[PDB]
Each structure stands twice: as structure tokens, then as C-alpha cells.
Design a protein around this nucleic acid. Structure first.
Ligand SMILES: [Mg+2]
Ligand SMILES: [Mg+2]
Length: 164
RNA sequence: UUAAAAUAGGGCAAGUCCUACUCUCCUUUACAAAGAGAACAUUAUGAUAUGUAAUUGUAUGUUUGAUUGGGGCAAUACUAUAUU
């Protein structure tokens, strides 16, 4: 809705330049980047794409020379894939146990107390608590946060760039 | 002699769809290595090290050829005797 600053004053949408909007949507691991990938407005984006293009069902149309040869398209595909390093987008994954049912134990937020026989656990709460020894033990499995390790995801060094 | 891309020449198992397998990429609770740290023994309750002590962890490797199975062989030969 209305964007409020630190002081609490409102900023109109005309004041925000488009470079900032592309910045928020470009920030990985955010809702804006996820909304761009999965569709910010499915009904609105479909009609927008349908109008800007030739048509939803129209194919190989002529507007009111010679087409590109197959030997050219093959050469253009090689120069795009192996020289310009242009790749296609991939999918984003989601927890299946939580996506199917949000109010189960696979999603988390269990209101039960697993530890029995203590009186301090019921008082200690909060989103961030104190855990002793995480620097040497970790959560278990994956412990580093994002953008910590090298050559992760599409930037793998096992199969090269074009393999992704 | 001049000018034209019609053919030859100048690289091409290609394009779309469906199915299946794999690679890649994510997850850790088990497999091997892990460069990080610990704890312990020894001299001191003050420092440098060596270990036969390491059962902790995070990136890395692997994780669908089961014949490494199943059969058969089963002391009391030979000549006789009795029993169920
Ligand atoms: Mg590990
Ligand atoms: Mg692994």
C-alpha cells in the first residue's frame, strides 16, 4: 500500500525510480524475486503478455525477403550457448511436506513442549534464542547461510557453464 | 566482354511433441575422506610438543551387476542277525 519511511512519512510511487524496483525484484531470497519468478499477478500478467504479443493462439503470422536458414539458426544457437553464455531459467523448489498442509508438524511451529521435566523452557521463548556451541556443531547438515560457499547452484564447476 | 544468385560450390544425423534414463542442483539420519576444532595420557596448575587419545563437525566422494546364493554329498566298509 502506502510506503512509509523511517520517520513515518509517505512516499508516492512516482518518487521511486524504476532502477530501485528492478533492484528489489533482483535481490535473491526475497518475496519480490519470488513474486517475479512465480508471477506477481497471474490474471494481470497474462492479459498484459497477450496484448503485447501477436496473440495467444496466433502462430507464424505476417504483419499487415527470406526467413533465417536452419544453418544460420544452428550457428546462432552455438554462438549464444557456448560464446555469449546465454542460458535458460530453471525452477525454484519448495518444501513438499509444508506446501501440501501448512498446519502439520512438517511445516514447523509446533506449540507442544518436547522436553518434559523442566520449568525454564516454558518461559524461554522468542524467534531468536541462545544456543551454545553452534560454531563447532552447527544445525546439522546445511549450516552456512546464502552466498557463503563458492560454486553453488548454476555456478558449478563440475560440468561447465552450458550444462547448468 | 559486361551484369545477375537459378543450379553446383562454400560445415550440419536438424526443428517440434511424448516417453525413459542420467548429469546438474538441493536435503542429512546411516558410507569413506574432511584441511576445523575439542577432550584424554605425560611434565606445570602457565604458555610452544609427542601420542597407541580422537567415536565432534561444514562444503568432498559414493549410495540399483548379490552365484559371497541355492542344491547334492551325511562315519559304522563286508558277511549276517532282530526289531518296530
Ligand atoms: Mg559432511
Ligand atoms: Mg554430498
Amino acid at each position: 500500500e502506502t510506503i512509509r519511511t523511517i520517520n513515518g512519512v509517505c512516499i508516492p510511487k512516482s518518487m521511486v525510480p524504476p532502477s530501485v524496483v528492478q533492484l528489489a525484484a533482483g535481490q535473491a531470497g526475497s518475496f519480490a524475486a519470488f513474486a517475479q519468478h512465480s508471477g506477481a499477478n497471474a490474471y494481470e500478467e497474462f492479459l498484459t503478455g497477450d496484448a503485447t504479443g501477436s496473440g495467444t493462439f496466433l502462430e507464424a503470422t505476417g504483419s499487415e525477403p527470406r526467413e533465417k536458414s536452419m544453418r544460420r539458426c544452428a550457428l546462432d544457437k552455438v554462438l549464444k550457448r557456448y560464446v555469449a553464455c546465454g542460458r535458460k531459467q530453471r525452477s525454484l523448489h519448495m518444501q513438499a511436506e509444508g506446501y501440501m498442509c501448512p498446519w502439520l508438524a512438517g511445516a514447523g511451529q509446533q506449540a507442544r513442549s518436547a522436553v518434559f521435566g523442566v520449568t525454564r523452557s516454558r518461559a524461554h521463548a522468542g524467534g531468536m534464542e541462545v544456543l551454545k556451541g553452534l560454531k563447532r556443531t552447527g544445525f546439522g547438515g546445511q549450516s552456512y547461510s546464502a552466498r557463503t560457499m563458492k560454486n553453488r547452484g548454476r555456478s558449478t564447476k563440475k560440468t561447465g557453464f552450458w550444462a547448468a
